[PDB]
Amino acid sequence: VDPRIQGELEKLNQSTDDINRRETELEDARQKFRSVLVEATVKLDELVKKIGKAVEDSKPYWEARRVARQAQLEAQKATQDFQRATEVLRAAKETISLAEQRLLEDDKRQFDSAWQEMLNHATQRVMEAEQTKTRSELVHKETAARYNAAMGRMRQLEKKLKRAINKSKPYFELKAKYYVQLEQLKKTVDDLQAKLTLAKGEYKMALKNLEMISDEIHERRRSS
Amino acid sequence: DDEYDYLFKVVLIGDSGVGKSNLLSRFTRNEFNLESKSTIGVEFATRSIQVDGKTIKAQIWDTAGLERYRAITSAYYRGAVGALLVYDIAKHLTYENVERWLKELRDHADSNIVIMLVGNLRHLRAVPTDEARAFAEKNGLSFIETSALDSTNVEAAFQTILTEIYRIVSQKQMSD
């Protein structure tokens, strides 16, 4: 008679409607993205026309502010890494032998690697924890210096371009807003695209197991 | 290659003695490698065109003419937006059973689908073209007859029914 045909058929003509629905939603999302981008460009352009040339030559300042924020974030991450490195160090020192502790701390003049053969073997993990800690402190101070450089730079550029920056604030503020909205709508478009592709995948799969049923009937009829 | 804008379901119905598979085989890219009518009961085949700037991918569900054990007709007609009722211009029994197949459509398909009646060298005129044309006119259906050597009007038929379906769905979308 017939086995599993009806269920996969129903799944197929359901995945049709699912595909059409997801596609319509995706196209509406694309349209909203387009109209928002157009509106953004024309509004920003007219704001440039009514604000003047301050926006253009005040552009290096806002760039210096961007690199300053990045140097800040990178500095924070490096400070975190330093902290966790330090806790690893002290937790390693919890292997006590307090005499050996200040043997490492008091002077690394001539550690003489042959002493490790004579004392606790758990000094190696302590010592390499000290190494990773000292390097993490290096990157910590380095990124701190980068942050201070970017900060002072953006401030002297600020005092060089004070009038232009204050006159150009609304353009860059509105442009920021439009950019946020654009990335949100683009996220929506991408997610709807993924839903659509998944629906088409379900369709293709139901079709594939349907012709799988047909092929299983092929060899069954081939037995003769 | 799944890049398209709409997906429309079109069913192929009518009397079995018309041989729809050979007019289909010219334009349809069968998705399976073996006959799906004797095994599954329906033979799928997909065709894509372009209408009004958008891409229309329509999948054709073929036959189920051996309806001796086809309790799958509920799923076979569900969701379909297009229907092709194919009869032979050399047989009158097919043209008489067109009413029966229309009953099957009204019983199992949606009440807003686009239906088109299609009429398919040695035999001479059994169905007058004007009679079938007036029949499709009184029943609110499209109509185009075509043979297998000059298959222009079947392509124009596909583009016609698909274009009408796109018109319906676009008019539905323009009322949001």
Residue numbers in the entry:
A (entry chain C): 41 to 264
B (entry chain A): 5 to 124, 128 to 183
What did the article's authors report about this structure?
Rab GTPases act as molecular switches and cycle between a GDP “off” state and a GTP-bound “on” state. The Rab11 proteins are master regulators of the surface expression of receptors. The mammalian ortholog of REI-1, SH3-binding protein 5 (SH3BP5), also has GEF activity toward Rab11 and was shown to be selective for Rab11 over Rab526. Detailed biochemical studies reveal that SH3BP5 is highly selective for Rab11 isoforms, with no activity toward any of the most evolutionarily similar Rab GTPases.
To understand the molecular basis of how SH3BP5 mediates Rab11A nucleotide exchange, we determined the structure of the N-terminal GEF domain of SH3BP5 bound to full-length Q70L Rab11A to a final resolution of 3.1 Å. The Q70L construct of Rab11 was used for structural studies as the marginally increased GEF rate for Q70L vs. WT suggested Q70L might form a slightly more stable complex with SH3BP5. The structure is composed of four complexes of SH3BP5-Rab11A per asymmetric unit, with each of the copies in the asymmetric unit sharing an overall similar architecture. The GEF domain of SH3BP5 is composed of a coiled coil that is kinked to form an overall v-shape. The v is composed of four long α-helices (α1–α4), with a small helix connecting helices α2 α3. Nucleotide-free Rab11A was bound to the GEF domain of SH3BP5 at one end of the v at a surface composed of the N terminus of helix α1 and the C terminus of helix α4 of the coiled coil. The SH3BP5-Rab11 interface is composed of a large extended, primarily hydrophobic interface (~1250 Å2). Comparison of the structure of nucleotide-free Rab11A bound to SH3BP5 compared with Rab11A bound to either GDP or GTP reveals an extensive rearrangement of switch I41, with only limited conformational changes in switch II. The main difference is in the conformation of F36 and I44 in Rab11. These residues pack directly against each other, which requires a constrained conformation of switch I. This constrained orientation of the highly conserved F36 and I44 residues is unique compared with previously solved Rab-GEF structures.
